[PDB]
């Protein structure tokens, strides 16, 4: 005798429930939206279970105390390049290009840094990649050489082993080397062009029909799509470099090419790296395909940061940013505490890896914007005349975004610990001060059931800007990290309570 | 084909749900506790409905702009004396006595004031009471006069009409007057004793067996219970007074008499006021029974306030109060901004009714504690060195309870508006300043889904002390009141959003 029963919701709408004796059952289709909760029917052998969740995303399981040369917080599980705000990985720079606030496309230091840190972290946690090297057998030849082209083993005196000298007119089919990899999709080759040309990779995919071809060309063009040809300019390449490309990413970013702020999603996947094809004149060597190539990405990010830091020690964001109603628009050229800090964390790791002082010097200079107020090309805000804050968005009036601030602090900590007592005193001073403000202000972000993203409600006198669940777990990840390098009860206590919110826990009411 | 399905909740516990095709139904017995929501099965002609609610308690429907001589906020629907924190209504003082923080029993100005304001408000909104007058016919006699007693119509030269002179030994049955009221339970009589004695009221109730008897005796005893005899001392009564007693309250407070902080609940109700019985010598007149007697209660509260105000203009709370972990205990003698303000609101109404300046003078003096910091026998706190606050609990460190602060402000407004430009300038100055702080600090109490009771989380660095729903609607009631006397957008905007929280509305997340 389950019977249908009408359910009046807050004296407004009516939904259809079920009743069995004294028990009333309410439909999840209503619950999902009403409570903003989550549910899935999951299959088992001969039965299904319904799996309910109060929240989404998960808190990172720390394995040890945080240290500057180790994994960066939870970034071992963070895929930066896959997101639709990354238009592509530049062929010239080898780092992500952003479209998040301009469809124009711009290099954004936060993305570039996070690209570095995530690959850095994954290098520490993953099994080693499988690696296949091609064209490495006794004389002579695996290459296909059409009429009018040439491919010769030659000796470059600046190098230890022979290389391959190629010649193929642009209108010819080019010289080609069979690859045939069906498992791994990170390609690298050492390259030196003596003319305009291209290295093309032929890629069979899950899309029925002809393969896709990705053309890496000697121009500064960013990205192009025409039918099944995707083009990336990689610059002149007239001195020896190692080119490393993630074909999975390069393929999908080409497929999803869009005039909008977001790359179109695709389910298309690569199935076989068929062969490589070269047009022009020059030399090539060490043609390899690997499961992953994390450290190369890390160094590309680290080197981009060094080259693009300005005289003030900052990485200027050259797009206008309007944080919302009540906040003055930020004109191009603004700095971000988060950008500065994430860059420090990347550069410190690069320094510790190489002892190349250009990395340390860049990091030390990055402290510059932290010393100036927001209206003076800086990043410093003051909460109610007492507490220094390093702004993710240096707005007028101040905005006090939590996650970006803590990222700035982790950057300062990396730097202070690495530069040592004399050189790292400025960073260590900025850090200790920021940490004071953090410990004091942290309760202002706690709703009793989740967290708030910024202090917009108090600064503007408006509704709280509540943090979505993935920012909530980010907040937790950040505090548990800090909890390993600072023994204050507030970090362990906040983490414990903030974790309970993920399972529908709440602060007590009176 | 409704089938049972297991429901995994946050990867922890499993409950039994129901499934019909793609719809999953979850049991309210789990929902009620998990989401802390509310539900009732309500009967209709031939069917039941399940009525779901996100919250409890309701927001008061204002009918006009707030003014000092009108109803006090939502108090027309507030029953003060019925609560179990009120031990009884004193026979001597005619106002509530509290046991909330001491089972000892003490007079608490907040309760006394609210008793006054609620009865004041109900006088404005209710239909007039039915009123029955007894012993008012031509000579001579409705009285029963046992052997050895006397009851005579006599003339007191200080009074316009004859009174009844009584004489009955304490061990006699007393002289008695039939009443017989089955509908109304507020008894009053004019009284002057010339000896020790008592006026007893015989009350048939829903409890089977003999009637209860309430004895109003010429001692200072508070309240006693022995079998079906309840005793209240009303003092000597040796000069003419009007005694007014709510028999419903007097009965239940006697029945539920307890050595604890809380009066025991009872379902016992009065059914008939049978008769009145007098022992001793003296005179009595104007014996009446009414549905309600609101203004008498109002004046009893107003007069208590005048008599019990100290030299500093305050009503000292003479019990220790420990607000919670992190707050130093308050030693007896502390003041409350809420007590001060509620008293002003009562005294201003009394003044406006009577033009008796003793009421205005008391109110003006009540401003005293607002001018001193909490550690200096005052009520003033300062939020982060910038914002004056009037504390409900003047704790160390400061506590910043919202509802009590706003009550203090409504009191200051009543006073400022009533005392006029010269006399009311101090109150008007304290009010304007408090209102500045309120408008600025209000967002700190908004969780995005409810409100917070105080700022304990920020002052102590701990979990938010979330406001239960009835304090949430109190907050709303208070802001919509303020919204009628101050046109700032923040009041109308906060009210709108805070109201939506009652129906499961939430601030947007990012």
One DSSP character per residue, B273-329 reads EEEEEEEEEEEEEEEEEES--HHHHHHHHHHHHHHH--TTS---B-S-B--STTSPP
Provide the resolution (angstroms).
1.9
Residues 72-101 of A with CB under 8 A from B: none
Q: How many residues does chain A have?
A: 510
Q: B432 to each of A211, B68, B108, B193, B416, how far by Cα in Å? A: 75, 17, 28, 51, 10
Q: How many alpha carbons fall within 13 Å on the CB side of residue A230? A: 22
Does residue A242 share a domain with residue A138? yes
Does residue B324 share a domain with residue B243? no
Phi, psi of B233 (to 5 degrees): -75, 135
Q: Are residues B510 and A2, on separate chains, in Cβ contact within 8 Å?
A: no
Does residue A367 share a domain with residue A282? no
Beta bridge partners of B216: B199, B232
Of the partner residues B385, B461, B466, the one whose CB lies closest to the CB of residue A448: B466
Residue whose C-alpha is closest to residue B232's, from B268, B201, B194: B201
Q: Are residues A5 and B50, on separate chains, in Cβ contact within 8 Å?
A: yes
Last residue of some domain: B235, B258, B291?
B291
Token pair 């805070």 is found at B498
Q: How far is CA A414 from the centre of its chain?
A: 19
Of the partner residues A18, A19, A465, the one whose CB lies closest to the CB of residue B510: A465
Residues 377-436 of B with CB under 8 A from A: 384-386
Please list every residue in chain B followed by a chain break, i.e. its C lies more than 2.5 Å from the next written N: 140
**Straight-line distance from the first to the last Cα atom of chain A, in angstroms, rounded to the nearest whole number:** 40
Does residue B314 share a domain with residue B215? no
Copy the structure tokens of residue A382: 């003051």
Q: Does A44 touch chain B (CB under 8 A)?
A: no
Pairing of strands A96-98, B23-27: unpaired
Residues 53-72 of A with CB under 8 A from B: 53-54
In-domain check, residue B24: no
Q: Does B26 touch chain A (CB under 8 A)?
A: yes
Cα pseudo-dihedral B125, B128, B130, B134, rounded to 10: 120
Characterize A46-74 residue by residue with b for buried, 16 or more Cβ atoms within 10 angstroms of its Cβ, and e for exposed.
Answer: eeebbbbbbbeeebbeeeeebebeebbbb
Tally of CB atoms within 10 A around B76: 18
Helices B402-423 & B469-485, crossing angle to 10 degrees?
20
Does residue B450 share a domain with residue B422? yes
Does residue B146 share a domain with residue B124? no
| Dist CA A345 CA A410 (whole Å) | 7
Does residue A424 share a domain with residue A321? yes
Copy the structure tokens of residue B508: 């947007």
Experimental approach was X-ray
Cα pseudo-dihedral B245, B251, B253, B256, rounded to 10: 180
Pairing of strands A3-9, B47-53: parallel
Residues in chain B closer than 8 A to A509 (CB atoms): 450, 465-468
Q: How far is CA B438 from the centre of its chain?
A: 25
Contact present, A278 and A163 (Cβ < 8 Å)? no
| A138 has binding-site annotation | yes
Q: Does B141 touch chain A (CB under 8 A)?
A: no
Q: How many alpha carbons fall within 13 Å on the CB side of residue A336? A: 27
Copy the structure tokens of residue A161: 């082993």
Q: How many residues does chain B have?
A: 510
Dihedral sign, Cα of residue A270, residue A274, residue A280, residue A281: positive
Q: What angle do CA B373, B379, B383 make, to 5 degrees?
A: 70
In-domain check, residue A420: yes
Token pair 């004031």 is found at B113
Does residue B356 share a domain with residue B320? yes
| A473 has binding-site annotation | yes
| Dist CA A43 CA A28 (whole Å) | 18
Report which DSSP code applies to A331. Answer: P
Q: What angle do CA A56, A62, A68 make, to 5 degrees?
A: 120
Contact present, B115 and B79 (Cβ < 8 Å)? no
Does residue B406 share a domain with residue B317? yes
Report which DSSP code applies to B208. Answer: S
A263: CB partners within 8 A, 6+ apart: A84, A86, A87, A99, A252, A253, A256, A257
Beta bridge partners of B279: B198
Q: Does B48 touch chain A (CB under 8 A)?
A: yes
Q: Does B507 touch chain A (CB under 8 A)?
A: yes
Q: Are residues B10 and A52, on separate chains, in Cβ contact within 8 Å?
A: yes
| B407 has binding-site annotation | yes
Does residue A395 share a domain with residue A492? yes
Q: What is the number of structural domains in chain A?
A: 2
Contact present, A150 and A282 (Cβ < 8 Å)? no
Characterize B437-467 residue by residue with b for buried, 16 or more Cβ atoms within 10 angstroms of its Cβ, and e for exposed.
Answer: bbbebbbbbbbbbbbbbbbbbbbbbbbbbbb
Task: Collapse the DSSP code of A87 into the 3-class scheme (helix H, G, I; strand E, B; otherwise coil) and give the result.
Answer: strand
Q: B392 to each of B74, B404, B407, how far by Cα in Å? A: 20, 5, 9
Last residue of some domain: B265, B291, B317?
B291
Q: Does A465 touch chain B (CB under 8 A)?
A: yes
In-domain check, residue A437: yes
| A268 has binding-site annotation | no
Task: Collapse the DSSP code of A73 into the 3-class scheme (helix H, G, I; strand E, B; otherwise coil) and give the result.
Answer: coil
Contact present, B179 and B276 (Cβ < 8 Å)? yes
Tally of CB atoms within 10 A around A220: 12
Q: Which domain, by its residues, includes A305?
A: 54-128+292-510
Chain A residue closest to B490 (CA)? Answer: A461
- Report cis status (omega within 30 of 0) of the bond before B397: yes
In-domain check, residue B47: no
Contact present, A450 and A467 (Cβ < 8 Å)? yes
| Dist CA B436 CA B430 (whole Å) | 10
* Furthest CA-CA distance within chain A: 90
Contact present, B327 and B161 (Cβ < 8 Å)? no
B35: CB partners within 8 A, 6+ apart: A35, A504
| Dist CA B50 CA A16 (whole Å) | 10
* Furthest CA-CA distance within chain B: 90
Token pair 């429901």 is found at B7
Contact present, B448 and A452 (Cβ < 8 Å)? yes
In-domain check, residue A446: yes
In-domain check, residue A314: yes
A38: CB partners within 8 A, 6+ apart: A32, A52, A53, A54, A55, A56
Residue whose C-alpha is closest to residue B301's, from B76, B83, B81: B81
Nearest Cα of chain B lies from the Cα of A45 at a distance, in angstroms, of: 14
Contact present, B154 and B165 (Cβ < 8 Å)? yes
| Dist CA B349 CA B298 (whole Å) | 9
In-domain check, residue A31: no
Residues in chain A closer than 8 A to B34 (CB atoms): 504
Does residue A211 share a domain with residue A251? yes
Copy the structure tokens of residue A464: 């709280």
| Dist CA B404 CA B18 (whole Å) | 47
In-domain check, residue A26: no
Residues in chain B closer than 8 A to A9 (CB atoms): 52
Contact present, A315 and A383 (Cβ < 8 Å)? no
Does residue B92 share a domain with residue B159? no
Contact present, B289 and B134 (Cβ < 8 Å)? yes
Task: Collapse the DSSP code of A450 into the 3-class scheme (helix H, G, I; strand E, B; otherwise coil) and give the result.
Answer: coil
Last residue of some domain: B251, B274, B291?
B291
Q: Does B105 touch chain A (CB under 8 A)?
A: no
Strand residue runs (E) in B159-240: 163-168, 175-181, 186-193, 198-205, 212-217, 224-226, 229-233
Of the partner residues A18, A502, A510, the one whose CB lies closest to the CB of residue B25: A18
Q: B75 to each of A80, A229, B79, B125, how far by Cα in Å? A: 58, 76, 8, 10
Contact present, B107 and B308 (Cβ < 8 Å)? yes
| Dist CA B404 CA B390 (whole Å) | 8
């Amino acid at each position: 005798r389950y019977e249908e029963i009408d359910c009046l919701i807050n004296d407004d709408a009516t939904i259809k429930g079920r009743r069995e004796g004294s028990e009333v059952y309410m439909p999840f289709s209503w619950m999902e939206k009403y409570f903003e909760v989550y549910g899935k029917v999951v299959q088992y052998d001969g039965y299904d279970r319904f799996e309910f969740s109060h929240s989404y995303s998960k808190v990172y399981a720390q394995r040890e105390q945080y240290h500057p040369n180790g994994v960066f917080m939870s970034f071992e599980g963070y895929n930066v390049e896959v997101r639709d705000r990354v238009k592509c990985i530049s062929g010239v720079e080898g780092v992500p290009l952003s479209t998040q606030w301009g469809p124009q496309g711009y290099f954004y230091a936060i993305q570039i840094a996070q690209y570095g840190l995530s690959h850095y972290s994954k290098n520490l946690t993953e099994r080693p990649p499988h690696v296949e090297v091609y064209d490495t057998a006794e004389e002579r030849s695996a290459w296909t050489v059409p009429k009018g082209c040439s491919l010769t083993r030659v000796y470059d005196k600046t190098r230890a082993t022979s290389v391959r000298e190629f010649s193929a007119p642009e209108n010819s089919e080019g010289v080609s080397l069979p690859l045939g990899n069906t498992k791994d999709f990170i390609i690298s080759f050492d390259l030196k062009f003596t003319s305009n040309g291209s290295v093309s990779v032929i890629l069979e995919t899950t899309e029925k029909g002809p393969p896709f071809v990705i053309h890496y060309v000697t121009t500064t063009q960013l990205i192009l799509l025409k039918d099944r040809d995707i083009t990336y300019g990689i610059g002149p390449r007239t001195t020896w470099t190692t080119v490393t490309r993630d074909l999975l990413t390069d393929l999908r970013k080409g497929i999803g090419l869009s005039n909008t702020k977001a790359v179109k999603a695709t389910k298309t996947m690569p199935r076989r790296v068929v062969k490589l094809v070269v047009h022009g004149t020059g030399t090539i060597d060490n043609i390899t395909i690997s499961t992953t190539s994390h450290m190369a990405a890390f160094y590309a990010a680290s080197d981009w940061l060094v080259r693009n830091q300005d005289e003030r020690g900052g990485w200027p964001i050259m797009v206008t940013r309007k944080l919302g109603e009540g906040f003055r628009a930020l004109e191009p050229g603004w700095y971000s505490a988060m950008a500065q800090g994430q860059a420090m964390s990347t550069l410190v790791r690069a320094y510790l890896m190489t002892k190349d002082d250009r990395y340390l010097k860049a990091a030390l200079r990055a402290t510059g914007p932290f010393k100036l107020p927001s209206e003076q090309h800086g990043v410093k805000a003051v909460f109610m005349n007492k507490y220094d804050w390093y702004e993710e968005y240096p707005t007028i009036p101040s905005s006090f975004v939590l996650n970006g601030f803590i990222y700035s602090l982790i950057g300062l900590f990396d730097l202070a610990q690495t530069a040592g007592e004399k050189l790292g005193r400025d960073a260590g001073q900025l850090y200790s001060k920021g940490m004071e403000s953090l410990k004091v202000m942290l309760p202002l972000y706690d709703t009793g059931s989740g967290t708030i993203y910024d202090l917009r409600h108090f600064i503007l006198g408006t509704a709280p800007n509540l943090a979505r669940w993935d920012y909530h777990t980010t907040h937790i990840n950040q505090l548990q990290l800090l909890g390993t390098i600072d023994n204050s009860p507030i970090f362990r206590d906040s983490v414990k309570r903030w974790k309970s919110y993920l399972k529908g826990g709440r602060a007590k009411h009176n």
